[PDB]
TrEMBL record, chain C:
EC number: 2.1.3.2
Pathway assignment: Pyrimidine metabolism; UMP biosynthesis via de novo pathway; (S)-dihydroorotate from bicarbonate: step 2/3
Pfam families: OTCace, OTCace_N
Top-level taxonomy: Eukaryota, Discoba, Euglenozoa, Kinetoplastea, Metakinetoplastina
Domain Aspartate/ornithine carbamoyltransferase Asp/Orn-binding: start-end pairs: 158-300
Family as reported in the entry's similarity comment: Belongs to the aspartate/ornithine carbamoyltransferase superfamily. ATCase family.
Function comment: Catalyzes the condensation of carbamoyl phosphate and aspartate to form carbamoyl aspartate and inorganic phosphate, the committed step in the de novo pyrimidine nucleotide biosynthesis pathway.
Organism field: Trypanosoma cruzi
Name of protein: aspartate carbamoyltransferase
Keywords: Pyrimidine biosynthesis, Transferase
Top-level EC class: transferase
InterPro entries: Asp/Orn_carbamoyltranf_P-bd, Asp/Orn_carbamoylTrfase, Asp/Orn_carbamoylTrfase_sf, Asp_carbamoyltransf, Asp_carbamoyltransf_Asp/Orn-bd
Catalysed reactions, as listed in the record: carbamoyl phosphate + L-aspartate = N-carbamoyl-L-aspartate + phosphate + H(+)
Gene3D superfamilies: Aspartate/ornithine carbamoyltransferase
GO BP, sorted A to Z: 'de novo' pyrimidine nucleobase biosynthetic process; 'de novo' UMP biosynthetic process; amino acid metabolic process
Amino acid sequence: GSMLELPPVASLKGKSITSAEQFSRADIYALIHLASAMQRKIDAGEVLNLLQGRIMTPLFFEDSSRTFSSFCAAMIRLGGSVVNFKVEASSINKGETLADTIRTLDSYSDVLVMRHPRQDAIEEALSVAQHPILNAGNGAGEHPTQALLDTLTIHSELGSVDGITIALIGDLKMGRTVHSLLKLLVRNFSIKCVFLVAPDALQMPQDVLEPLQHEIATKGVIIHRTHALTDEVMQKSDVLYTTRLQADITIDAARMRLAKEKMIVMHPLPRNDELSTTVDADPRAAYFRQMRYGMFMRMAILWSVLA
Amino acid sequence: SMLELPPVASLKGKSITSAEQFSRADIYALIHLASAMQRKIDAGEVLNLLQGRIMTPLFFEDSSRTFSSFCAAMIRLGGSVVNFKVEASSINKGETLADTIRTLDSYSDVLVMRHPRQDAIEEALSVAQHPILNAGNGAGEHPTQALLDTLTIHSELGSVDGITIALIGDLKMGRTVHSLLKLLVRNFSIKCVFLVAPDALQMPQDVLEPLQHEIATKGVIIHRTHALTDEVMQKSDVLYTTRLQKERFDDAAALQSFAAKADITIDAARMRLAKEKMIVMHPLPRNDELSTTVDADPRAAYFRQMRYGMFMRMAILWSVLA
Amino acid sequence: ELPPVASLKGKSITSAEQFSRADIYALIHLASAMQRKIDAGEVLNLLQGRIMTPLFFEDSSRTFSSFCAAMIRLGGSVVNFKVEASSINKGETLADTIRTLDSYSDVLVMRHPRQDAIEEALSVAQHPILNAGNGAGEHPTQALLDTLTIHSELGSVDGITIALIGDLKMGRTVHSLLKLLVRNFSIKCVFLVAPDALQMPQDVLEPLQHEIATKGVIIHRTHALTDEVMQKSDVLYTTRLQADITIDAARMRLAKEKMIVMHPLPRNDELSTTVDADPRAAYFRQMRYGMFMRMAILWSVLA
C-alpha cells in the first residue's frame, strides 16, 4: 500500500491508555483503518521510519508472551526502539518503590507499557509519569489494547461488528480481557446479543455490568447468562470468545459441529484445555490470526500516541 | 556535527575505570557535550552518530538507572544493544569471566560492566580489545555516576568550584561517593566537604589519603559528622545522600546506623533549615533516608539527576566511539 | 558487494546435511566480504525493518549473542523474548509459543534440550527457524562457522587431518561438523578422540559410511591425544565433557607449525589457558568468524 497514508488518530496523541472507556466509535474505526494500512505496508515489505529515535520501555511486573512481544515488535516496525528493562534484574530488589521505578524509566523513554498484578498500580504510575503509559493489564481490571485488537479481529474476519451475537466464555470474573471487550463493544457498537458463559462463581462482575446497564437497555442489547456452551449459544453466536481460568464450556472439534459456518472462535491466549488443539485446523479458528492483528493494532496505537 | 556535538577527543577508544582518569578540561568538555545532547534530543532531533555500533551490557548486579540509561543513550545516538543476560549464559556451564569478556568482545564495540568484585574490571581489561565502561565494581567506583553528578551540580547551581557539599550515608561501601569525592577534589576547588556517616561507615582511608595533597593545595575544609547538624544544613549547597547497604550488615555498623538513622534522614522538616538555593541529590535507589515529603521541593534534584545521566552517557559513548 | 546465497532464501536451517559444497563456499565468501566491510567501518542496512526472535530454552553465550549481533549489523532488529518471563509459566505449549513469536518475527532462532523440538516448531511456523542446537542432535551454524574458521586460518579444507576430541556422543557441534566435512570435502583423516563410552554415535557414522569409503577417508579411534594425533593433525577440535585428552602448552610442543586448535566453547579444563597466547589458538577468532558467518546466513535466508 505505497500510496496509502498513515494518518495518526489525533485523539490519542500524547495520551495514556488505561481503559476501553476512553475510546469512541470513531476512534476505534480510525484505529482499525490505520492498523489495516499498517498491515498492507508491512506485508508488502515497506520499511517504516515513523518513530526513529523514540523509545518504548516495557514494565512487566507479571508474565507475558503476546502483549510484551507484540508491543516490542510494533515499536520496532515503526522504526522505534526498545530498552529491555527487566523488573527481576532491577533496583526493586534493593527496595526501590513502584513510583520511583516509574520515574526512573520515565526519565529515558517516550512511552511506557505497563502490566501489573495490582489493579490500582496503573493509576499510581500515571500520578508520577510525564510520558504516556499504556496499560498492558492491571490485575483483574482491564486490558484495553486487547479489546482493540479483538475488535479489529472481529471486523476483519466477519466484516462487521454491529449486529453480532458474541459469547464471552470462561473466567469472566477475573478476565481483564472480557471486562475491556464487553465495555468496548457495548459502548460503541449495536451488539445484538451477548452470552455470558461461566460457572456462577466466575460470572461477569457487577462492576462491569452496572455501568453498562443504561446503554444495554437503550440499545436493546440482549444479555443471556449460561453455565454451559448450550446448543443455543453454539448455533447463534457469530463469535465464541473463550478464556483460560485465571463446566461443559470446552470448545473442541465435536462441539464445533454445532457452530454456524460464518463465525469465528477467539481466545486472547495463553490457552489451556478449554480450547482443544482439535479446533486449530478449522478455518473458523481465528485465535492465531488474532495475535498478528494485535501487532498491527499496536502499531496503530503507538504511532497515534507518539506522532 | 563537529560544531554542535564535537566528541571529547581524549576519550576516544579508551576504557573508563576510575574518576581519577579525567582532567578538569575533560569534565567540562563532557558537560558541555551532554548539554548539547540534551538540547538536541529535547527539541525532537534524531541522531545517527553511532549507527551500526553495538554496546553489550554485562551486569552481574541489579541495576535500574545505569543499565537503562546506557541502553537509552546508545539508542539515542543511533547505536544498538545486544541484550546479553548473565543468568542465561555459559557462565552456568563454568565459563570464566575472562572467557565471557572475550566472547562479548568478539561482537561488540563497547562493553558496559557492573560486577560485585572490585578487581573484576581490571581482569576484564586484561583480555578485551574494545573499551569497557565501569558501571560499578564492588565497593570501588562508579565513574560515570560521578560525571553525571557533576553535570547535575553544574547545571542546577551554575558552578562547581566553591561549593560546600555533604556526602551522606554509607560512605564506606558507597562506590558513588568514592568516585564523586575523587572527581570533585582532584578537578575543582571545593570549599568544604561534610562527611556525614556513622563512624563504622565513614569514608575510607583508601579514598581520603591519596586526596590529601589536593585537599591541602586547594585548602578544602573536610569535616566528619554523624548527623545532619544545623551547620551542615545551613552551609551546604549540595546534600548528596545515599542508601545504607543494610544487606551487608561486626555488629557495630548495624547498631551505629540505627542510632544515626533519624539524624541523617532528609525530610521536609529537616529541609526547613536548608538554604533557599541548593540541591538535594541521591544516586538512587533510595529507601527511607530520603523522604517522599521532599519530592515536591524545587530543591529536589534527584529525579532530574537521572535524566542528566542519560545525556552524560550520550556524551561519553559518542566520545569513546567517535 | 554482498550477493545473498540464493539456495538459502526463505528456508529453515536444521541440519548440516542440507548444504552443498557450493552453498558452503558461497557462504564463506559472503561472510569474508561482510567481515571486510564491517572491519572498514561500513554500515549495512540490508535487513532494516526485519525481526529476529531468539527462542533459547537452554543457556547460551556465543550462539545467542552472535545471532543478535549479526542481525543488528545487517540493519535488522531483535525482539528479546525470555522463556522464564513468558506464558509458558501459565501452561502454554511449545507449539503455541512458536505460533506466538512467529506472528511477529521474520526469523526465529531456536535452541532446545529436546532433539525433536525443532521439528515440532517447524510444523507450526510460517517463517524460517534456525536451529541453534537441538539436544544432542546438531548445531548446523556452528559447523558452518567452524568450516569458515578452517578455511580462513589454514587455506584448504580438502586434505586436512582433523581430530575431534571430547564428548563425541553428546556433542552436537561435532555431530554437525563431521557431517558437513565428510559430505562436502575430501578429508584425509579424522581422529575420533574420546573415552569409549563417549565415542561418536553410530547414528552419525553410519549415514556417512558410503562417503567415507568412496573418498577414502581414514577414520581412527583413540582414547587419548597420542603423539601420532598431535603430530599429524592440521586441526585439533576439542570439546567440553558434557588427563589423556587435555590440551595444554606442554602437549602443544608436539603439534605441527601449520595447524590450529579450535573449540566451540564454552571450555572447562580440557583446553588450558596456557595455550591462549599461541598463534595456533584459533578458538577466540572462531567466535568472530561466527558472527560473520551468521551475517551471511541471515542475509541469505531473508534476502
